[PDB]
Amino acid sequence: SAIPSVFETLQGYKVPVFFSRYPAGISIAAQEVEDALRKIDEEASEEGTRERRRALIRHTNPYGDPFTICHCSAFPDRLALLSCLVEVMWIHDDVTEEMDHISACREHDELAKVLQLDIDPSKFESGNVRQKSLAVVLRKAIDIDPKQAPAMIEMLRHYLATFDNIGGDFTRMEEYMPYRIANCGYWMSSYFIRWGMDMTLSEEEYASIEQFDIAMGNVLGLTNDYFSWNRNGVVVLMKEHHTTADAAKMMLLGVIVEQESLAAKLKEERLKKPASKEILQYFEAIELYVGGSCYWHSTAP
Amino acid sequence: VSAIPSVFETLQGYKVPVFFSRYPAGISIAAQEVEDALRKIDEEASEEGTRERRRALIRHTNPYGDPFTICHCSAFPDRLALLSCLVEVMWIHDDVTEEMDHISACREHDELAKVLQLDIDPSKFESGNVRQKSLAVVLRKAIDIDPKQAPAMIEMLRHYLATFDNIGGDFTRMEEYMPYRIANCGYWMSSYFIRWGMDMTLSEEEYASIEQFDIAMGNVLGLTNDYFSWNNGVVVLMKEHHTTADAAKMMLLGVIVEQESLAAKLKEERLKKPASKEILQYFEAIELYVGGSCYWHSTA
Numbered sequence: 001s002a003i004p005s006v007f008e009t010l011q012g013y014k015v016p017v018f019f020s021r022y023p024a025g026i027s028i029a030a031q032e033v034e035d036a037l038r039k040i041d042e043e044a045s046e047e048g049t050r051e052r053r054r055a056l057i058r059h060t061n062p063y064g065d066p067f068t069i070c071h072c073s074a075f076p077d078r079l080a081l082l083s084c085l086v087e088v089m090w091i092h093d094d095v096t097e098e099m100d101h102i103s104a105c106r107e108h109d110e111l112a113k114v115l116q117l118d119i120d121p122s123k124f125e126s127g128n129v130r131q132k133s134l135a136v137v138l139r140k141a142i143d144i145d146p147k148q149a150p151a152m153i154e155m156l157r158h159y160l161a162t163f164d165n166i167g168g169d170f171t172r173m174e175e176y177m178p179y180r181i182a183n184c185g186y187w188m189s190s191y192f193i194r195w196g197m198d199m200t201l202s203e204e205e206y207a208s209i210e211q212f213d214i215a216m217g218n219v220l221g222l223t224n225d226y227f228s229w230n231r232n233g234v235v236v237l238m239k240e241h242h243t244t245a246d247a248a249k250m251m252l253l254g255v256i257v258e259q260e261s262l263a264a265k266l267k268e269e270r271l272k273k274p275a276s277k278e279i280l281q282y283f284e285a286i287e288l289y290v291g292g293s294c295y296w297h298s299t300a301p
Numbered sequence: 302v303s304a305i306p307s308v309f310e311t312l313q314g315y316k317v318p319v320f321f322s323r324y325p326a327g328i329s330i331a332a333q334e335v336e337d338a339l340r341k342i343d344e345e346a347s348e349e350g351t352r353e354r355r356r357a358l359i360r361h362t363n364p365y366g367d368p369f370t371i372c373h374c375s376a377f378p379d380r381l382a383l384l385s386c387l388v389e390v391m392w393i394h395d396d397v398t399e400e401m402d403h404i405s406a407c408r409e410h411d412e413l414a415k416v417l418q419l420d421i422d423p424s425k426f427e428s429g430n431v432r433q434k435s436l437a438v439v440l441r442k443a444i445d446i447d448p449k450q451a452p453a454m455i456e457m458l459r460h461y462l463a464t465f466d467n468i469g470g471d472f473t474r475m476e477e478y479m480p481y482r483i484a485n486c487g488y489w490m491s492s493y494f495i496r497w498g499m500d501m502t503l504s505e506e507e508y509a510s511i512e513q514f515d516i517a518m519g520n521v522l523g524l525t526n527d528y529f530s531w532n533n534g535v536v537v538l539m540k541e542h543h544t545t546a547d548a549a550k551m552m553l554l555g556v557i558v559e560q561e562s563l564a565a566k567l568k569e570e571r572l573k574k575p576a577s578k579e580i581l582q583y584f585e586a587i588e589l590y591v592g593g594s595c596y597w598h599s600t601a
Binding site for chain 1: 315318319321323405416479542543544545548550551552553554555556558561562563565568579
């Protein structure tokens, strides 16, 4: 392994519904991270709201938390920070999903006011609870790695500017899939996969695995669609191919498994050339992220 | 801890990007001896220059391994040699009869069935077709190594020839194609020999308790054969849902993966009640059969 020993391996074969070829693990700091996530949930969502209820369901899987599993490769102190930061973005996603597109877009722009390198959380006490909570955890995530903070902020601003920026329904996967990689948060989550390991890829290194990284982003979001069906690839496929929902769900599963195979082919292609420890760490950590996401969805009640 | 004989080494399918199965793959410690026996029976049970002879060589040239030494890697090696060559003669027969019209194929099934007798005397078939001649010789050996199980084995083989290729028409729904394909791909024969190869049986009640699991695994086996041979359930799916081939191939892969999960669910349900060592032996060996078959088709 190229990753520090900060996770335990999970036995995915024991879960019948778990179909991914990729591994799953869980962070040695799971308890502390779950505790941090409970705290941020009580501060970033108001009591009795829908978003508060959706946050609590997200953190009550008996088999583990989405953050402690998917981001099990991260150093524990970074894991606590990135988990709580992404959690505020997830609360925000739940809040804005129930909004008309105009109001959602305004809410994304309001939250993005907090995304500043010089953020002073005290200047947002008059703001909504997601602004206040994001500001506090973003401050800490800047402090722990100031060298990476400009890139982090750029990634977060680009996420809020683009992840939701669509006018209506899709009718072909060729258009839905690039949208869905961004919409499921993969570019933010995979950024924090690297950040949580205190590492980066060079421009040349990232370019060399970009197709791999798109295939894994497809797996992540489309697997999210597959389990949620119990905006969705099942509907896109039904419309594109004029089939029943059961036929389209089976097609979606086939698409996911082929993307998992494609990622494995692209990784094998890259590993024919010399690969830095950073390239090897990202491969290992992003496979745990994707396999872990499949595991979490496969066990979540 | 393994419940089956220590007669195989594990294969790392994770290293094969096209390999998608959740089930494991292994390779017999007796692989060279079994492959030599198969090469010999292939010379005797198919004539030179024929298409079936050529198909037999392709089937035994995958550099990653042989279908018998991988899928039946759980078998005791002397039994593995016998069952591999017996099934291989049936496989040659399948290849020969696939190129015929249905009525002619069924006549050949009836002719081959004449050898499936508990008192088979191989010399009495020295004037028949080369499949009759070779099946007679290997059947006699397979009866003699286990006379207690031989009536059941013969009943299985007669049943296979009576059921695997009874449809000359076409399928328009998977609900009907799937039960047909489990028989047509030989799964009931192969899975019988997975137990026979380990010198064990399942009782009637034991088998009934895992029949739905077994059917799910049989669906995986034949439909995975279809998936890799498409480059067939893909055709059924295009006709049933009126889609392109590419769309139906993705639908087929989903159906396969769902069937692999369904098998895992059914096994987990069975294991909520007490299970004999024979049940556990079959679970582990049949998972190696199905995963190994995916591996062989993935690397062929």
